[PDB]
Amino acid sequence: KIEEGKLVIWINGDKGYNGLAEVGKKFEKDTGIKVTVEHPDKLEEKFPQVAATGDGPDIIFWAHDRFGGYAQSGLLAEITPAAAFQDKLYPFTWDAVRYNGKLIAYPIAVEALSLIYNKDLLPNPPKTWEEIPALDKELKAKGKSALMFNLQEPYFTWPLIAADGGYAFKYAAGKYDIKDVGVDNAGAKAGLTFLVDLIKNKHMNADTDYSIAEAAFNKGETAMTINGPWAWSNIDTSAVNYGVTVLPTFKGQPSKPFVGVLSAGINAASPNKELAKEFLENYLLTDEGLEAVNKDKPLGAVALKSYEEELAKDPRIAATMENAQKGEIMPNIPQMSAFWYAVRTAVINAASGRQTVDEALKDAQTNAAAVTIVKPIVYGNVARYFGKKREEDGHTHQWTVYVKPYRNEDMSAYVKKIQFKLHESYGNPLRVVTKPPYEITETGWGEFEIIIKIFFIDPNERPVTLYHLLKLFQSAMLGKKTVVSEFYDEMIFQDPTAMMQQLLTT
Amino acid sequence: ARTKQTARKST
Amino acid sequence: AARKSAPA
Ligand SMILES: OC[C@H]1O[C@H](O[C@H]2[C@H](O)[C@@H](O)[C@@H](O)O[C@@H]2CO)[C@H](O)[C@@H](O)[C@@H]1O
């Protein structure tokens, strides 16, 4: 469970979590409510896996692209900012956090990648990707390199891939078409081919990650990096005099960075929704709160009009907005995680020779379009100990073995029947339930494996089989209290029929 | 359909 | 004879 009377906030370790901690103390000084800020690794993965079972933080911070998928999986409370509060942020930022006409997060700040150049090593930054090899040669002469950035995260390579016609999903008729992916067009191939040729020609190194690229640029070892506003603090700390500028063009085209809106969502499972609204609207999303975060790690172009205007004069923020303007706002649709996973695969493989560009992107094109629907379920048994052992048969317990949907939905929409196979010591051990609740009540003396087979109204949709050890004895101060052994799992429907997609989606 | 690659979680 | 079990 999420502890009440406290706020737990998750934010990525590249963002100003110390400055958020300061807003945290401010909130605690005022309200007596303890705020704890954590930066767990792979939180874009950790939040959905914990929040699935109603655990994790009260507040989750990530780029808005993940939030449609979070809200789709029921992981987010719809936020209730008054009209007055909405006027204080840019309408553009609210759009990034609107899924199915519902606001599902508080926008914080607009992030785009820029080219970051050591002004000493390189007074005049390259206007093109193409001139970079010749620059890395002139610089390899002096024991330097031209360019190092994170090749492990497709976010950083995507601007190049998008430059000559790569796209995620083509927007049309007021929605993104998840069948029309632009990952394996001539544009996308030319961009990823150029990245691969930079590696093959030792202008760059395929294992270069965030830490290596950053550490390299901040020690003055590499003339350029590609990174977002958050990276500026560590460069400020370093001796490096740096410019933030427009990304190089590729084949004469602007590099097109995916534009993220750093967004703050409230956990659906939070007992502290009012406290999270208070903290976000009235402490964080103020000039004082954003300054406290921004001075730790720059946010970019903040959603809050008042503070955006104060910061707008900074040329690093103008370059960010220039790159953003050449880029595309990321969709927030659930399919973005599939797209990102697919392109991470293609870029890493291609970059490390494991695949060619054409294989990698052909694979990524198919993976980015792959519809995966998730039905979270709970299954197991409740078992109530009788007053005393019935001697007739020797049974000690009444038990119910069950499968139910995790979230209160109508499982019968797509489930035709659930079969529970009991031990041979039961007559008609193959018990079938065609209608909810999907459960069998029985009496017995023993624990045995029950096999549970779930059937779908589309019979082509392969049945799911579960294994449950019926439990009667937990063994623990609980006495006549009903013993519980239930488990959360997720049923996964990969590219199901439109019939099945319809019943699977309420 | 299949279950998740990741283990079931005790509630 | 499938495995059934109880503690007594
Ligand atoms: O690399 C794929 C990744 O891209 C974006 O994540 C960014 C994030 O937006 C930035 O705030 C910063 O944290 O860098 C990340 C890249 O390592 C997407 O928002 C994310 O969903 C996606 O997986």
Coordinates of C-alpha atoms and ligand atoms in Angstrom, one line a residue:
Chain A
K1 CA 0.0 0.0 0.0
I2 CA 1.0 3.7 -0.4
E3 CA 1.4 5.2 3.2
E4 CA -1.2 8.0 3.9
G5 CA -0.2 11.4 5.4
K6 CA 3.1 11.5 3.3
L7 CA 4.0 12.2 -0.4
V8 CA 6.4 9.8 -2.3
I9 CA 7.5 11.4 -5.6
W10 CA 9.4 9.5 -8.4
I11 CA 11.5 11.6 -10.9
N12 CA 14.4 10.5 -13.2
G13 CA 18.0 10.8 -11.9
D14 CA 18.9 13.2 -14.7
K15 CA 16.3 15.8 -13.4
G16 CA 16.6 18.2 -10.4
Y17 CA 15.4 15.9 -7.7
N18 CA 17.4 17.9 -5.0
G19 CA 15.5 21.1 -6.1
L20 CA 12.2 19.0 -5.9
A21 CA 13.4 17.8 -2.4
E22 CA 13.6 21.6 -1.5
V23 CA 10.0 22.2 -2.7
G24 CA 9.3 19.0 -0.6
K25 CA 10.7 20.5 2.6
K26 CA 8.8 23.8 1.9
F27 CA 5.6 21.7 1.7
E28 CA 6.5 19.8 5.0
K29 CA 7.5 23.1 6.9
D30 CA 3.9 24.5 5.9
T31 CA 1.7 21.3 6.1
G32 CA 3.7 18.9 8.5
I33 CA 3.4 16.4 5.5
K34 CA 6.7 14.6 4.9
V35 CA 7.7 14.6 1.2
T36 CA 10.2 11.9 0.1
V37 CA 11.8 12.3 -3.5
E38 CA 13.3 9.2 -5.1
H39 CA 15.0 8.7 -8.5
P40 CA 14.7 4.9 -9.1
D41 CA 16.6 3.5 -12.2
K42 CA 14.3 2.7 -15.2
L43 CA 11.4 4.5 -13.4
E44 CA 9.5 4.6 -16.8
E45 CA 9.5 0.7 -16.3
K46 CA 9.4 0.6 -12.5
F47 CA 6.2 2.9 -12.1
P48 CA 4.0 0.8 -14.4
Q49 CA 5.1 -2.6 -12.8
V50 CA 4.6 -1.3 -9.1
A51 CA 1.5 0.9 -9.8
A52 CA -0.2 -2.1 -11.6
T53 CA -0.8 -3.7 -8.1
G54 CA -1.7 -0.3 -6.5
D55 CA 1.9 0.4 -5.1
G56 CA 4.7 3.0 -5.9
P57 CA 4.8 6.8 -5.5
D58 CA 1.9 9.3 -5.0
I59 CA 3.4 11.4 -7.9
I60 CA 5.3 10.1 -11.0
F61 CA 7.4 12.5 -13.2
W62 CA 8.2 11.6 -16.8
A63 CA 7.9 13.0 -20.3
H64 CA 4.2 13.0 -21.3
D65 CA 4.7 10.3 -24.0
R66 CA 4.4 7.5 -21.3
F67 CA 1.2 9.0 -19.7
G68 CA -1.4 7.8 -22.2
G69 CA -0.2 4.2 -21.5
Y70 CA -0.2 4.8 -17.7
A71 CA -3.8 6.2 -17.9
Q72 CA -4.8 3.3 -20.3
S73 CA -3.6 0.8 -17.6
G74 CA -5.7 2.8 -15.0
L75 CA -2.4 3.8 -13.2
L76 CA -3.3 7.6 -13.0
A77 CA -6.0 9.7 -11.2
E78 CA -7.7 12.2 -13.5
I79 CA -6.4 15.6 -12.2
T80 CA -8.9 18.4 -11.1
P81 CA -7.1 21.7 -11.8
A82 CA -9.7 24.7 -11.7
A83 CA -10.0 26.8 -14.9
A84 CA -8.0 29.5 -13.0
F85 CA -5.0 27.1 -12.5
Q86 CA -5.1 25.9 -16.2
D87 CA -4.8 29.6 -17.5
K88 CA -1.4 29.8 -15.6
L89 CA 0.2 27.1 -17.9
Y90 CA 0.5 27.2 -21.8
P91 CA -2.5 25.5 -23.6
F92 CA 0.2 23.5 -25.6
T93 CA 1.5 21.8 -22.4
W94 CA -2.1 20.8 -21.3
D95 CA -2.6 19.1 -24.7
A96 CA 0.4 16.8 -24.1
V97 CA -1.3 15.5 -20.8
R98 CA -4.8 15.2 -22.3
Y99 CA -5.7 11.5 -23.1
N100 CA -9.3 10.6 -24.2
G101 CA -10.3 14.2 -23.5
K102 CA -9.2 13.8 -19.8
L103 CA -6.2 15.6 -18.2
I104 CA -4.0 12.8 -16.8
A105 CA -1.0 14.8 -15.5
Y106 CA 0.3 18.4 -14.7
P107 CA 2.7 19.6 -17.4
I108 CA 5.9 21.0 -15.9
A109 CA 8.4 21.8 -18.8
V110 CA 9.0 21.4 -22.6
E111 CA 12.2 19.4 -23.3
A112 CA 14.0 19.2 -26.7
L113 CA 17.5 18.0 -27.5
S114 CA 20.0 20.6 -28.7
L115 CA 23.6 20.5 -30.0
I116 CA 25.9 21.4 -27.1
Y117 CA 29.4 22.6 -28.3
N118 CA 32.6 23.3 -26.4
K119 CA 33.2 26.9 -27.7
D120 CA 37.0 26.6 -27.0
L121 CA 37.5 23.3 -29.0
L122 CA 35.0 24.5 -31.7
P123 CA 34.1 28.3 -32.1
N124 CA 31.9 27.6 -35.2
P125 CA 29.7 24.6 -34.7
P126 CA 28.8 22.3 -37.7
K127 CA 25.5 23.2 -39.5
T128 CA 25.4 19.7 -41.0
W129 CA 25.8 16.1 -39.7
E130 CA 27.8 15.4 -42.9
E131 CA 30.7 17.8 -42.1
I132 CA 31.2 15.9 -38.7
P133 CA 33.5 13.1 -40.0
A134 CA 36.0 15.8 -41.3
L135 CA 35.7 17.7 -38.0
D136 CA 36.4 14.5 -35.9
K137 CA 39.5 13.9 -38.1
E138 CA 40.8 17.5 -37.5
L139 CA 40.0 17.0 -33.8
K140 CA 41.3 13.3 -33.6
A141 CA 44.7 15.0 -34.7
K142 CA 44.7 16.9 -31.3
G143 CA 43.7 13.7 -29.3
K144 CA 40.0 14.8 -29.2
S145 CA 36.7 13.6 -30.8
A146 CA 34.0 15.7 -32.5
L147 CA 30.8 14.3 -31.0
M148 CA 29.7 11.9 -28.2
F149 CA 26.0 11.4 -27.1
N150 CA 24.0 8.5 -25.5
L151 CA 23.6 5.8 -28.3
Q152 CA 21.7 3.4 -25.8
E153 CA 18.5 5.6 -25.7
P154 CA 16.7 6.0 -29.1
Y155 CA 15.5 9.5 -28.0
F156 CA 19.0 10.9 -28.8
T157 CA 19.4 9.3 -32.3
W158 CA 15.7 9.9 -33.3
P159 CA 16.4 13.5 -34.5
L160 CA 18.8 12.2 -37.2
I161 CA 16.4 9.2 -38.0
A162 CA 13.5 11.7 -38.4
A163 CA 15.5 14.3 -40.4
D164 CA 15.0 12.8 -43.9
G165 CA 11.5 11.3 -43.3
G166 CA 11.5 9.0 -40.3
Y167 CA 8.2 9.3 -38.2
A168 CA 6.6 7.4 -35.3
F169 CA 2.8 7.5 -36.1
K170 CA 1.2 9.7 -38.9
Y171 CA -1.6 11.9 -37.3
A172 CA -4.8 11.9 -39.3
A173 CA -8.6 12.5 -38.8
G174 CA -8.0 13.6 -35.2
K175 CA -6.0 10.5 -34.1
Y176 CA -2.6 8.7 -34.7
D177 CA -2.8 5.7 -37.1
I178 CA -0.8 3.0 -35.2
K179 CA -0.6 0.9 -38.5
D180 CA 1.1 3.9 -40.4
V181 CA 4.7 3.7 -38.8
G182 CA 7.6 5.6 -40.5
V183 CA 10.5 3.6 -38.9
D184 CA 11.6 1.7 -42.1
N185 CA 11.2 4.4 -44.8
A186 CA 14.2 5.7 -47.0
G187 CA 14.4 8.7 -44.6
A188 CA 14.7 6.6 -41.4
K189 CA 17.2 4.2 -43.2
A190 CA 19.4 7.1 -44.4
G191 CA 19.6 8.6 -40.9
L192 CA 20.4 5.4 -39.0
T193 CA 22.8 4.4 -41.9
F194 CA 24.7 7.7 -41.2
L195 CA 24.8 6.9 -37.5
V196 CA 26.1 3.4 -38.3
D197 CA 28.8 4.8 -40.7
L198 CA 30.0 7.3 -37.9
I199 CA 30.6 4.2 -35.7
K200 CA 32.1 1.9 -38.5
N201 CA 34.5 4.9 -39.3
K202 CA 35.4 5.4 -35.5
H203 CA 33.8 8.9 -35.3
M204 CA 31.7 7.4 -32.5
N205 CA 31.5 4.3 -30.2
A206 CA 28.3 2.1 -30.1
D207 CA 28.6 1.6 -26.2
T208 CA 28.8 5.4 -25.5
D209 CA 25.9 5.8 -23.0
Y210 CA 24.6 8.9 -21.1
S211 CA 27.4 8.8 -18.3
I212 CA 30.3 8.3 -20.9
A213 CA 29.0 11.0 -23.4
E214 CA 28.4 13.5 -20.5
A215 CA 31.7 12.7 -18.6
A216 CA 33.6 13.0 -21.9
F217 CA 32.1 16.4 -22.9
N218 CA 32.5 17.9 -19.3
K219 CA 36.2 16.9 -19.2
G220 CA 36.6 18.7 -22.6
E221 CA 37.5 15.4 -24.3
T222 CA 34.8 15.8 -27.0
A223 CA 33.9 19.0 -29.0
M224 CA 30.1 18.3 -29.1
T225 CA 27.2 16.4 -27.3
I226 CA 23.5 16.1 -27.9
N227 CA 21.4 16.5 -24.7
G228 CA 18.4 18.3 -23.1
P229 CA 18.2 21.3 -20.7
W230 CA 18.8 19.0 -17.6
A231 CA 22.4 18.4 -18.6
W232 CA 23.4 22.1 -18.4
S233 CA 24.0 22.1 -14.6
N234 CA 26.8 19.4 -14.8
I235 CA 28.5 21.4 -17.6
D236 CA 28.2 24.7 -15.5
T237 CA 30.0 22.8 -12.7
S238 CA 32.8 21.7 -15.2
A239 CA 35.3 24.3 -16.7
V240 CA 33.8 23.8 -20.2
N241 CA 32.5 27.0 -21.9
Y242 CA 29.6 25.7 -24.0
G243 CA 27.0 26.9 -26.5
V244 CA 23.5 25.4 -26.9
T245 CA 22.5 25.6 -30.6
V246 CA 20.3 24.1 -33.5
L247 CA 21.0 20.4 -34.2
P248 CA 23.0 19.8 -37.4
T249 CA 20.9 19.4 -40.6
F250 CA 20.9 15.9 -42.3
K251 CA 20.6 15.8 -46.2
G252 CA 19.8 19.5 -45.9
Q253 CA 16.8 18.8 -43.6
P254 CA 16.4 20.0 -39.9
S255 CA 17.1 17.2 -37.3
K256 CA 13.6 16.6 -35.7
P257 CA 13.9 15.9 -32.0
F258 CA 10.9 14.3 -30.3
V259 CA 9.6 17.1 -27.9
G260 CA 8.8 15.9 -24.4
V261 CA 6.7 17.7 -21.8
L262 CA 8.0 16.7 -18.4
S263 CA 4.7 15.9 -16.6
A264 CA 3.6 15.0 -13.1
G265 CA 0.9 12.3 -12.7
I266 CA -0.9 11.3 -9.5
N267 CA -1.0 7.5 -8.8
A268 CA -4.5 6.1 -9.2
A269 CA -3.8 4.1 -5.9
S270 CA -2.8 7.2 -3.9
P271 CA -4.7 7.9 -0.6
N272 CA -3.0 11.4 -0.8
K273 CA -4.5 12.8 -4.1
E274 CA -5.5 16.1 -2.4
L275 CA -2.0 16.5 -0.9
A276 CA -0.4 15.8 -4.4
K277 CA -2.7 18.4 -6.1
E278 CA -1.8 20.9 -3.3
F279 CA 2.0 20.2 -3.6
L280 CA 1.9 20.3 -7.5
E281 CA -0.4 23.3 -8.1
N282 CA 0.6 25.5 -5.1
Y283 CA 4.3 24.6 -4.3
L284 CA 5.9 23.1 -7.4
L285 CA 4.0 24.9 -10.3
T286 CA 5.0 28.4 -8.9
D287 CA 7.9 30.7 -9.7
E288 CA 9.6 29.7 -6.4
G289 CA 9.0 25.9 -6.9
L290 CA 10.2 25.8 -10.6
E291 CA 13.3 28.0 -9.7
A292 CA 14.2 25.5 -6.9
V293 CA 14.0 22.6 -9.5
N294 CA 15.4 24.6 -12.5
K295 CA 18.6 25.8 -10.6
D296 CA 19.3 22.1 -9.7
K297 CA 18.8 20.9 -13.3
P298 CA 17.2 23.2 -15.9
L299 CA 13.6 22.1 -16.9
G300 CA 13.7 23.8 -20.3
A301 CA 10.8 26.0 -21.4
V302 CA 8.4 25.7 -18.3
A303 CA 4.6 25.3 -18.8
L304 CA 4.0 28.0 -16.1
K305 CA 3.6 31.3 -18.1
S306 CA 4.9 33.6 -15.3
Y307 CA 8.3 31.8 -15.0
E308 CA 8.6 30.9 -18.7
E309 CA 8.6 34.7 -19.4
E310 CA 11.4 35.3 -16.8
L311 CA 13.6 32.4 -18.3
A312 CA 12.7 33.0 -22.1
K313 CA 15.6 35.6 -22.5
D314 CA 18.2 32.8 -21.8
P315 CA 19.6 31.8 -25.3
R316 CA 20.0 28.1 -24.2
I317 CA 16.1 28.1 -23.9
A318 CA 15.7 29.9 -27.3
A319 CA 18.0 27.2 -28.9
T320 CA 15.9 24.4 -27.1
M321 CA 12.6 26.1 -28.6
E322 CA 14.3 26.4 -32.0
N323 CA 15.1 22.6 -32.0
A324 CA 11.6 21.8 -30.5
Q325 CA 10.0 23.9 -33.4
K326 CA 11.9 21.7 -35.9
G327 CA 10.9 18.6 -34.0
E328 CA 7.5 17.0 -33.3
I329 CA 5.6 16.8 -30.0
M330 CA 5.6 13.1 -28.9
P331 CA 2.2 11.4 -29.0
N332 CA 1.0 10.3 -25.5
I333 CA -0.8 7.2 -27.0
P334 CA -0.3 3.8 -25.3
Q335 CA 1.6 2.5 -28.4
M336 CA 4.6 4.9 -27.8
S337 CA 6.2 2.4 -25.4
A338 CA 6.1 -0.3 -28.1
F339 CA 7.5 2.3 -30.7
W340 CA 10.3 3.3 -28.2
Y341 CA 11.2 -0.4 -27.4
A342 CA 11.2 -1.2 -31.1
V343 CA 13.5 1.8 -32.1
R344 CA 15.8 1.2 -29.0
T345 CA 16.3 -2.4 -30.4
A346 CA 16.9 -1.2 -34.1
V347 CA 19.4 1.5 -33.1
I348 CA 21.4 -0.7 -30.6
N349 CA 21.5 -3.7 -33.0
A350 CA 22.4 -1.6 -36.1
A351 CA 25.0 0.4 -34.1
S352 CA 26.7 -2.8 -32.9
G353 CA 26.6 -4.7 -36.3
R354 CA 24.2 -7.4 -34.8
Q355 CA 21.8 -6.3 -37.6
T356 CA 22.0 -4.1 -40.7
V357 CA 20.0 -0.9 -40.8
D358 CA 17.5 -2.6 -43.2
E359 CA 16.9 -5.7 -40.9
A360 CA 16.8 -3.6 -37.7
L361 CA 14.3 -1.0 -39.1
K362 CA 12.3 -3.8 -40.8
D363 CA 12.0 -5.5 -37.4
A364 CA 11.3 -2.1 -35.6
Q365 CA 8.6 -1.2 -38.2
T366 CA 6.7 -4.5 -37.3
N367 CA 7.4 -4.1 -33.5
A368 CA 6.3 -0.4 -33.4
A369 CA 2.9 -1.5 -35.1
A370 CA 2.5 -4.6 -32.7
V371 CA -0.8 -4.2 -30.8
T372 CA -0.3 -5.7 -27.2
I373 CA -3.4 -5.5 -25.0
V374 CA -2.9 -6.3 -21.2
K375 CA -5.7 -7.7 -19.0
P376 CA -4.5 -7.6 -15.4
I377 CA -6.0 -10.4 -13.3
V378 CA -6.0 -11.7 -9.7
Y379 CA -6.4 -15.5 -9.1
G380 CA -5.9 -17.9 -6.2
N381 CA -8.0 -19.1 -3.3
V382 CA -9.8 -18.0 0.0
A383 CA -10.0 -20.9 2.6
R384 CA -12.1 -20.7 5.9
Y385 CA -11.2 -23.3 8.6
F386 CA -14.4 -25.1 9.9
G387 CA -15.2 -25.0 13.7
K388 CA -13.8 -28.6 13.9
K389 CA -12.9 -31.4 11.5
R390 CA -16.1 -33.1 10.0
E391 CA -15.3 -36.8 10.7
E392 CA -17.7 -38.1 8.0
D393 CA -15.1 -37.2 5.2
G394 CA -12.3 -35.5 7.3
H395 CA -12.7 -32.1 5.6
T396 CA -11.5 -29.1 7.8
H397 CA -11.9 -26.1 5.3
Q398 CA -14.4 -24.5 2.9
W399 CA -12.4 -22.9 0.0
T400 CA -13.2 -20.8 -3.1
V401 CA -10.7 -20.9 -6.0
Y402 CA -11.2 -17.8 -8.3
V403 CA -10.0 -15.7 -11.2
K404 CA -11.2 -12.1 -11.3
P405 CA -10.1 -9.0 -13.3
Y406 CA -7.8 -6.8 -11.1
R407 CA -9.8 -3.7 -12.0
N408 CA -13.6 -3.8 -11.5
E409 CA -14.4 -4.5 -15.3
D410 CA -16.8 -7.0 -17.0
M411 CA -14.4 -10.0 -17.8
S412 CA -17.4 -11.9 -19.5
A413 CA -17.0 -9.2 -22.4
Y414 CA -14.1 -11.3 -23.8
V415 CA -13.9 -14.5 -21.5
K416 CA -16.2 -17.3 -22.7
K417 CA -15.5 -19.7 -19.8
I418 CA -12.9 -20.5 -17.1
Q419 CA -12.2 -24.2 -16.3
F420 CA -10.8 -25.2 -12.9
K421 CA -9.3 -28.8 -12.8
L422 CA -9.4 -30.1 -9.2
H423 CA -7.6 -33.2 -7.7
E424 CA -9.1 -36.6 -8.6
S425 CA -10.4 -36.7 -4.9
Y426 CA -13.2 -34.5 -6.2
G427 CA -16.1 -35.7 -8.4
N428 CA -16.5 -33.9 -11.7
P429 CA -12.9 -32.4 -11.1
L430 CA -13.1 -30.4 -14.3
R431 CA -15.4 -27.5 -13.1
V432 CA -16.5 -25.0 -15.8
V433 CA -17.8 -21.5 -15.1
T434 CA -19.2 -19.7 -18.2
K435 CA -20.4 -16.5 -16.3
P436 CA -18.9 -14.3 -13.5
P437 CA -18.0 -14.7 -10.7
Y438 CA -15.3 -17.1 -12.1
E439 CA -14.9 -19.2 -8.9
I440 CA -15.5 -22.7 -7.4
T441 CA -16.5 -23.2 -3.8
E442 CA -15.6 -26.6 -2.2
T443 CA -14.7 -28.3 1.1
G444 CA -11.6 -30.5 1.6
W445 CA -8.7 -31.5 3.9
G446 CA -5.7 -31.1 1.5
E447 CA -3.7 -28.6 -0.6
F448 CA -3.3 -29.7 -4.3
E449 CA -2.4 -27.9 -7.6
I450 CA -5.5 -26.5 -9.5
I451 CA -4.9 -25.9 -13.2
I452 CA -7.1 -22.9 -14.4
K453 CA -7.7 -22.6 -18.2
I454 CA -9.3 -19.2 -19.4
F455 CA -11.2 -19.3 -22.8
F456 CA -11.9 -16.2 -24.9
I457 CA -15.1 -15.4 -27.0
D458 CA -12.7 -15.5 -30.0
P459 CA -11.6 -19.2 -29.7
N460 CA -8.6 -18.5 -32.1
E461 CA -7.3 -16.4 -29.1
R462 CA -5.3 -19.2 -27.4
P463 CA -6.5 -20.1 -23.9
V464 CA -4.4 -19.0 -20.8
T465 CA -3.5 -21.8 -18.3
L466 CA -2.7 -20.8 -14.7
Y467 CA -1.3 -23.1 -11.9
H468 CA -2.4 -22.4 -8.3
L469 CA -1.5 -24.5 -5.2
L470 CA -4.8 -24.3 -3.2
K471 CA -3.8 -23.1 0.3
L472 CA -5.7 -23.9 3.6
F473 CA -2.7 -23.4 6.2
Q474 CA -0.6 -20.1 6.1
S475 CA 1.3 -20.9 9.4
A476 CA 1.4 -16.0 11.7
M477 CA -1.0 -15.0 14.6
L478 CA -4.2 -15.4 12.4
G479 CA -6.6 -18.1 13.8
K480 CA -10.1 -18.7 12.3
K481 CA -9.3 -15.7 9.9
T482 CA -9.9 -16.8 6.2
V483 CA -6.6 -17.9 4.7
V484 CA -5.8 -16.0 1.3
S485 CA -3.4 -17.1 -1.4
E486 CA -4.0 -14.9 -4.5
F487 CA -1.6 -13.6 -7.2
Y488 CA -1.7 -10.7 -9.6
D489 CA -0.7 -11.5 -13.2
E490 CA -1.4 -10.0 -16.7
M491 CA -3.0 -11.7 -19.7
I492 CA -1.4 -10.5 -22.9
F493 CA -3.3 -10.4 -26.3
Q494 CA -0.8 -9.9 -29.2
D495 CA -2.4 -8.5 -32.4
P496 CA -5.9 -9.9 -31.7
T497 CA -9.0 -9.8 -34.1
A498 CA -10.9 -6.4 -34.2
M499 CA -13.9 -8.4 -32.7
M500 CA -11.5 -9.4 -29.8
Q501 CA -9.9 -5.9 -29.6
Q502 CA -13.5 -4.4 -29.2
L503 CA -14.5 -6.8 -26.3
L504 CA -11.0 -6.3 -24.7
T505 CA -11.4 -2.5 -24.7
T506 CA -14.1 -0.8 -22.5
Chain B
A1 CA -3.0 -15.0 -25.2
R2 CA -0.1 -15.6 -22.7
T3 CA 0.6 -14.4 -19.1
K4 CA 3.3 -11.7 -18.6
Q5 CA 7.0 -12.6 -19.1
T6 CA 7.6 -11.2 -15.6
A7 CA 6.5 -13.4 -12.6
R8 CA 3.0 -13.2 -11.0
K9 CA 3.0 -11.0 -7.8
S10 CA 1.6 -12.2 -4.4
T11 CA -1.1 -9.6 -3.1
Chain C
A1 CA -2.1 -40.6 -7.6
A2 CA -1.7 -36.7 -7.8
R3 CA 0.2 -35.1 -4.8
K4 CA -2.3 -33.9 -2.0
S5 CA -1.0 -32.7 1.4
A6 CA -2.1 -31.6 4.9
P7 CA -0.2 -31.1 8.2
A8 CA -2.6 -33.2 10.5
Ligands
LIG1 O1 15.0 6.8 -25.4 C1 13.6 6.5 -25.4 C2 12.9 7.3 -24.4 O2 12.8 8.7 -24.8 C3 12.2 9.6 -23.9 O3 12.9 9.6 -22.7 C4 13.8 10.7 -22.4 C5 13.0 11.7 -21.6 O4 11.9 12.3 -22.3 C6 13.9 12.9 -21.1 O5 13.2 13.6 -20.0 C7 15.2 12.4 -20.5 O6 14.8 11.7 -19.3 O7 15.8 11.4 -21.4 C8 15.1 10.3 -21.8 C9 15.9 9.5 -22.8 O8 16.9 8.6 -22.1 C10 10.8 9.2 -23.7 O9 10.1 10.2 -22.9 C11 10.8 7.8 -23.2 O10 9.4 7.4 -23.0 C12 11.5 6.9 -24.1 O11 11.5 5.5 -23.7

